[PDB]
Design a protein around this ligand. Structure first.
Ligand SMILES: O=C1c2c(c(C(F)(F)F)nn2-c2cccc(-c3n[nH]c(=O)[nH]3)c2)CCN1c1ccc(-c2ccccc2CN2CCCC2)cc1
Ligand code: NA
Ligand code: NA
Lengths: 52, 234
């Protein structure tokens, strides 16, 4: 099921490469060590509401 | 927007307002980054010379975090015509970069296939703008927002008296009298995925506003990601 099963546990982008899950992020985020989460490189990353 | 809710502090930070010489909002826009605004091509005819206002939520009262930006380059899609309303997309490069703060931040640009399979398949998106609060009325002074259900592709074609091209998409309500309106054009249509907001549509057009059996037509951003990327390189 890979990417079709809960976005392959990716925070954002999900792709299939060699029958496995491969995650990536939008610009302004770095992929975590777990290769799933997206970490903002600086303040105000894209698509985040500024509620704080 | 007809109906919907007002945008509270920091709820719609990617919203841009196109303002004519008379300092009045005529179209919306989406912040992609510090130098770029995503808008509708047809909005470029609604005013001779225009500026871009950001961090604004109430037009009549200055917000201190509010900022005016001039346009350096206007990157319009040559394939656009008033006869078809197809390729209703433009990119604006600004003279000065936007300062990101509360109410001022860009919306994410998703990747093509992921946007198609994972965003466009969610139940709703959020549309927002300073446009008309009623089909017959004046421009809103308050920035509003409305959650809109993604509308079935053939069902969309059926509701329309015009041709719904592959660059266009329907979102809205068949009976509930809440939708976007005149002045909301060029504005954002975002889809939330895991607490992150991705840009999915550009308010394009509709037959009136919140008309029963009709919907809001938006430019399918996924159809233009390469053209958008290339625009930001120039
Ligand atoms: O888009 C609008 C419109 C109008 C008003 C109004 F009523 F306020 F004046 N608002 N508005 C508007 C503006 C923004 C959002 C929404 C919206 N979003 N969601 C929702 O429900 N409405 C509504 C008037 C009609 N028009 C329009 C109708 C049809 C086309 C079209 C469509 C396809 C091909 C060619 C054409 C162009 N052809 C058509 C015939 C000659 C040129 C263009 C414009
Ligand atoms: Na203001
Ligand atoms: Na409707």
């Amino acid at each position: 099921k890979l990417c079709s099963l809960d976005n392959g546990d990716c925070d954002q982008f999900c792709h299939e490469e060699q029958n496995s899950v491969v995650c990536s992020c939008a610009r302004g985020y770095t992929l975590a060590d777990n290769g799933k989460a997206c970490i903002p490189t600086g303040p105000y990353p894209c698509g985040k509401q500024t509620l704080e | 927007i007809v109906g919907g809710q007002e945008c509270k502090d920091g709820e719609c930070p990617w919203q841009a307002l196109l303002i004519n010489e008379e300092n009045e909002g005529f179209c919306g826009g989406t912040i992609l980054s510090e130098f770029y605004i995503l808008t509708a091509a047809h909005c470029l005819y609604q005013a001779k010379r225009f500026k871009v206002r950001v961090g604004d939520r109430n037009t009549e009262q200055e917000e201190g975090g509010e900022a005016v930006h001039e346009v350096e380059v206007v990157i319009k899609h040559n394939r656009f015509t008033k006869e078809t309303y197809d390729f209703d997309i433009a990119v604006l490069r600004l003279k000065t970069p936007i300062t990101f703060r509360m109410n001022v931040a860009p919306a994410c640009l998703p990747e093509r296939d992921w946007a198609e399979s994972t965003l466009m398949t969610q139940k709703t998106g959020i549309v927002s703008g300073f446009g008309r609060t009623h089909e017959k009325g004046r421009q809103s002074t308050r920035l509003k927002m409305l959650e809109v259900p993604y509308v079935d592709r053939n069902s969309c074609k059926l509701s329309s008296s015009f041709i719904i091209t592959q660059n266009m998409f329907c979102a809205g309500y068949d009976t509930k009298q809440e939708d976007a309106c005149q002045g909301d054009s060029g504005g954002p249509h975002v889809t939330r995925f895991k607490d992150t907001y991705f840009v999915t549509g550009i308010v394009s057009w509709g037959e009136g506003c919140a008309r029963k059996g009709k919907y809001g037509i938006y430019t399918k951003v996924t159809a233009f990601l390469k053209w958008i990327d290339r625009s930001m390189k120039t």
